[PDB]
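Can't attach files on this board, so I'm pasting raw text. These are the components:
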Amino acid sequence: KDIEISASESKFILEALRQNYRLDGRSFDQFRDVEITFGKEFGDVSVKMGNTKVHCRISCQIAQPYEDRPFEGLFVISTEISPMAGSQFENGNITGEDEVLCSRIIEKSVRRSGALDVEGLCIVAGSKCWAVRADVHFLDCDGGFIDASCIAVMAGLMHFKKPDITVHGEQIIVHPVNEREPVPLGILHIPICVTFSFFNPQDTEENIKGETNSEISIIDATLKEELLRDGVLTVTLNKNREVVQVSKAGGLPMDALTLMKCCHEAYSIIEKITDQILQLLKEDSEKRNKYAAMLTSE
Amino acid sequence: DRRRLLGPAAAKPMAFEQELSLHTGFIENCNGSALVEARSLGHQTSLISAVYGPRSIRGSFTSQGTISIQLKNGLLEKYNTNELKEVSSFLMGIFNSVVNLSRYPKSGIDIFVYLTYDKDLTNNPSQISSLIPHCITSITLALADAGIELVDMAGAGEANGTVVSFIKNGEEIVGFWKDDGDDEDLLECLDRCKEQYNRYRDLMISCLMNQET
Amino acid sequence: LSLQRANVEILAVEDKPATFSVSQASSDLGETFRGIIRSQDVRSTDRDRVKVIECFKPGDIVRAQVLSLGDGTNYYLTTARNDLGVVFARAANGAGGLMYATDWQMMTSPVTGATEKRKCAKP
Amino acid sequence: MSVQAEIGILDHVDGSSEFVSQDTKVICSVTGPIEPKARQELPTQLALEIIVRPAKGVATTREKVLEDKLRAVLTPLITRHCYPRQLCQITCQILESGEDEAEFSLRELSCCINAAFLALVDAGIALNSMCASIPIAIIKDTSDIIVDPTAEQLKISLSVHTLALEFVNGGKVVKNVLLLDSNGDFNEDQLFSLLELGEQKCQELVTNIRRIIQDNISPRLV
Amino acid sequence: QIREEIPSKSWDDSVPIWVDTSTELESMLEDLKNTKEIAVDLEHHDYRSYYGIVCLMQISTRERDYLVDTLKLRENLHILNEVFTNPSIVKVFHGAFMNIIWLQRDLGLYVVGLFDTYHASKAIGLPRHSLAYLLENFANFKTSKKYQLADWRIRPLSKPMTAYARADTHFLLNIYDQLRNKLIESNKLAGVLYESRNV
Amino acid sequence: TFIFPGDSFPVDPTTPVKLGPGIYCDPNTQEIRPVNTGVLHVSAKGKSGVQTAYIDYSSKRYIPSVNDFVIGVIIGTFSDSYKVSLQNFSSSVSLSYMAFPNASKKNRPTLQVGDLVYARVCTAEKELEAEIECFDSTTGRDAGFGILEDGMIIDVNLNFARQLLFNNDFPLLKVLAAHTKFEVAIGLNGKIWVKCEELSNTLACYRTIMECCQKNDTAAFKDIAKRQFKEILTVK
Amino acid sequence: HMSLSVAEKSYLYDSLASTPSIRPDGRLPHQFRPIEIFTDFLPSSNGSSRIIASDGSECIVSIKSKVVDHHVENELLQVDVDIAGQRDDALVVETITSLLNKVLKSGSGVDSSKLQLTKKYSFKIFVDVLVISSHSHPISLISFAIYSALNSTYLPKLISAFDDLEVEELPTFHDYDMVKLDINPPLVFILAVVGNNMLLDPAANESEVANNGLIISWSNGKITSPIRSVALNDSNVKSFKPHLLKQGLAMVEKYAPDVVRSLENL
Amino acid sequence: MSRLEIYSPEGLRLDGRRWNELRRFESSINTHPHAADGSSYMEQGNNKIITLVKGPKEPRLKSQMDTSKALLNVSVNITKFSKFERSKSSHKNERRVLEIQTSLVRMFEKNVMLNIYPRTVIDIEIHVLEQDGGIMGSLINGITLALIDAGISMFDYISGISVGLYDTTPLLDTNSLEENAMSTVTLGVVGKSEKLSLLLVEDKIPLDRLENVLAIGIAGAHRVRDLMDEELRKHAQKRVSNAS
Amino acid sequence: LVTDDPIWMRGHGTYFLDNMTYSSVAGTVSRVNRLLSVIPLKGRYAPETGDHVVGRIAEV
RNA sequence: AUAAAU
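---
Top answer:
Structure tokens for the assembled complex are below.
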């Protein structure tokens, strides 16, 4: 299945980008506002960017660690696409170019980066370990899937609580949420993912050698803008003033200076997003109990 | 596994006079079928062969037929999948001489052989080689029952791990399988398997006559 | 159904002196022999202009005679003569009741009173 | 029977909905009629691609059964002969179980049926009639028939039931019983008392459903 | 080398120059000697002749359009070989593969320095190779079919006819400028000159 | 008076009613019954003996019908016709080359893949590939159907498009004319083509129609155009 | 692999099936085509080889070792076969894999005594095969490479005592020092049956028209199992007289030492 | 049991190299003429890579055919004996490998016009015989060489490099030990330009470091590019001498 | 860089930017008239019009 | 008879 786009659309949107205009009425460095909604259960988070809707669910179960890593727990991230986000996606297509890329971006941003403290997922060394699972559900698509997913996974992990455990060797009674409160998963850092789309002016005249048409670069492109881009760039940054990961495969060849500018622009966005994410975690944490102060011991 | 139900992955499996019975045409799902049961001493083998074809292949320009054979483990998981493929390759090297391929252009014949059971008794203070002549017997029956033209009746025998398949009344050879055993058994195995062939042949011919009648 | 032709699939073949030979195959795979009836091979009357929509219908059974093998994809089928045409059919692509053949170019249903335009044969 | 639903929430799909009963929340999407894969093609009728996604983990054989039962309900509902050689993708993403998924799949199935129907309505696909599904359960001591049981009620149940009926004539005439999935063991008197009280609350639900449909859709029309 | 495109002379700016005497032809020759490029076309008739005869030749410079009576000047036209085989003067044809043959046959004329806009159009990958298409989109001119099926033989030639004879070359040099420039840009110019030499 | 599927019909069985979108005639039981949800519209002509009806319902998946104006995109070219898809993930439609003004077997049209065309559906069968034609006889001597150039195309639900094409009381075309000059093609397949002299105006029109498509408000739409054309100024 | 017309195949059969058999090339029924062999180019491995045929057929073998408990690890020599651009699962792959593992069994055609370290531990040998390119049955090609590789393999040397039953010392190996793997790798020859003639090293075109084929193993200066008849193609497979089978075994029995002699050069 | 460091105060690394040394580079063209249209054997350090370019040729399935451009496919075979410790399982389906394959495709899709071979297919088969750090950079160099050998048109060279970072200063061309010790950056450089085809960072990297690390890599990649030109030209001179 | 003369017509094996003409392949620089091209050392065989070729049917 | 069977 190949989507059909009119030649008229391809000429219109491209010309509009040369006039610094876009369909959804945004800027080039602007990122669509992200809305984060938490469900009743911990680990249930819904991320919304304009029309883009993604849902993440964090779950865990008692499991045994690998032989190679007796002190580390298990952690996996699932991002299987479905025709619900659009008929362009094949059901279970986990080997397609865009799918594998997205899967690899998230993995290198959360798993590989060590955003989650897997060492704190161990109950008894080389015997029993917690197995945290992050399931991302792509409900609908209006672009920015990678950005939506990173926010969804991280917000979920920071939301998530795991039943309190008392361990005495090989026997462990997992206290229920009724008996005692659940324990929040450890976090080392908060990675945020930014997606950049590159374009070509296709214009006859440039006013100056000194100042030139250069390259088109926008942030968080919509579905219509994502099909017309000539280049893809994803940079992951945090509030710790460091680059988590950056993935550029082919596309429109760009200077090292341009990448840095995108990287510096993304840093201002990930700062606002991280603080906002923490805020909505703070508002939901205080939200849960109508009578919590009456509840307290210490 | 999201395809089947494998259960808990943290668990572990359990750790601890020649006689023939031939029946064909008992499966209505395919074009030809066969049941072969053999009991010798403490060792017995029961396998089922299913034949589907000849069915037309769209766009096929082959001037002859195409045979595909696959062995399966019905119950006991003993034989390796790698070894099953090897026998399958051996079996196809046999029936490509037996089956009149010129009769089925642009067509293909799929052959499924289910090794539902084999029972082995070993005393304490190869293996699949013994099943091979029974697989050949089953397929040759299932093909003849299906209506597939065979140039000759294919049969074989197992002598000290040396399997050799015969046609044209033992005058020629359509397959040879030798594993381990002992040397200088060339002349002996050729004579012992030739007797097993002739024995398996007459019972195979009689089988068709019986059921066909 | 297409505009310039009509492709089908072969089910059974008439024998020679009625008796038939049923070809057993899976219809949900595509292993069944496929055939194509040209618009010029629909009827001898007015071979040039023939409306395929008013002749055949998806699901309708058609008795025809094969002019030639053609390619591996499509056989050549003609319903030019009188004893050839749509034999068994139902109203509304099979949603309605059974219909019977009266006129050569008209098929009626003596149950709901529905009449659909087909290419009918002669008993 | 205080359910809540929204229609047309997804942008890149022909039709969508979000059905919520108690905890159980299911979002559904429908695209069709569209071009089908060769292996999906049906010469005369419409081909249904039905997908069910669980709230936790990946789709297993459990959801494969949910897809199968949901197929038995949606198939006779759709006027399939209107779309020969064509495809209709139907995807259900269960967002919240509302029940112990390790033991039951009752409420998730009923919510998927109601959501799928609503998504088909939104998509504008030919339907022969209307449909509604409710989960029912029976208590261990009291043996009472509880319509729309909670998760806690299911734990202490002797039998669990999924009932989906086909309605015509302004939601007053039961055309047929599309699906009845009873797991457990039964007594005849309880069954018909269940069906009598069940029909009443179902009829009340349709009336409520009609109200919701008109209220949301009328501002769009002229 | 890419250069600014020189538009065609404005319509009605100049009358086509009719060439049917030896003298007019010689003047025309002196004129073509002064160009760096010229556009050429022919009209050919095959109904009342076994092999065919060349009935008209159209030649345009950047400034003027010429219409040559190749019937009256059949035995005179060979002197154009001075310009037609001068390699430093581009000769622009559209659809000239037959016309090359006929120049030879009838007039004894050859072309060294050919650029064929048909190969140019193909190399660039335009949707249609038709000559009128260029006139339709670049000259805002609507092409007319009917006269061609007739006999160009009859004279005096109709004023409406003159535009059609006039139309063919009046516009071609600009089209050459535009096609040339894009071919240079596209890394495909070398290919078109090769095809043109084969024609 | 909202109408739902399976709803009872007041009209008598002996007297026929002309088919309308939303209304379905069962091939088996011959009964006429509504299958869509919305407002029933019925037109009666003369003192007695004739009737017509349909249902205005919210649907966005187009189904080709005779005499419907549609805007399609020609993905590919066959031997004798163009393959044009009115909508995404929808069956292809057959457009004849000979379905153009001044057509000939010698000269094919110059339309290339990716071009927008304004077309009307001539023959549309449920079990057969649909067909469209560039020129429609019913409209007049000249169809006004020609491939669109440039501009911008807009996705819109079938109801919004039908109201924009047949309803003169729809203020959308008026409120857009009060802001800028523009030409518009309207397709019953839920496509709207808009083109101005400047891109900023076309973009402004796009954004208004989208919001109007979203908003569905008569009062909002007049204001909506106000804030949209205003926002482009500052953005400039 | 190779695609030939009906005319070409018949001509080939006439050329080769003739009583004075002639190779299309001109070879004799016992002459092999020239091959090139490289060894010891993978320092990361214990042993390695690379064989290049005349038709471009190329195979790479690697030898790696691992200390295992021979009381729980029955098979001490595991052969793994692979081909880039080819799925692992394929009938040809598993068959050759199964076949090769039988050729190099621990107690069949290999002196597994040289792999033993202590009472309780021994060296597990992993023979990884990579077939880059091949135009016929690569079984004999792989066999030559495995041979060359196993004859240039060097394993670590043990330091600790060799009695785990009593003292039970942890297996430690002296640094730097290594011991060459003294072993007798078997060879696998493949023959072609065209009419009544038997050809050693069948070419691609030759195999296409062959009536049948033979796979005969060779170890310790004598014929050994596995011995397998094999259909080189599937369109011209016919039964063969027993004397042909005895002819093939005899043919290998006299030409194999010549091959080994040209192959035994260090 | 042992322990080791990264960078000593003496400016020496674990293997003996200093902070700015490229490993031994050997390059080889036309290694498999009878197996592919283009072929290259790469030796960058202990890394050993066979690269085969098969095409442009007819697609095996008409379903997968583009009438506007050639289909470019890349399959990387990381052998089970590439490392010191033999891997039990195959690495072919591994998500890490699928990303690598995808990454490489994205890189060269913009580097070959791929508009002049319509209705054809270019298959690139790679076999990694030995691995010792910077395998991604070596993969890039192997494809670029093999593609050129096949006479397949491309706009420019694409050189791949590996970067190692300790404290203030990164280490050029990292091996497995260093890769284990510290985060690395893999750079795809087009020709002699400053434009990156591939920027790959999989581990944590201070934000201050990258600008300077990039500067070191680009300079080193230019040297690598110069060597490659020398490697092919030198071979041509050698081949001509052999002919003479 | 092969040349910096903008008068040249760039042929196969080359590409250009303003005055500069670069090589796209590894081979020898060829100058025929005004047509600058670079002949590759290796590559696929190319069909010229009028060649006598021998071929084996692939598909019907 | 001004460019025919993607």
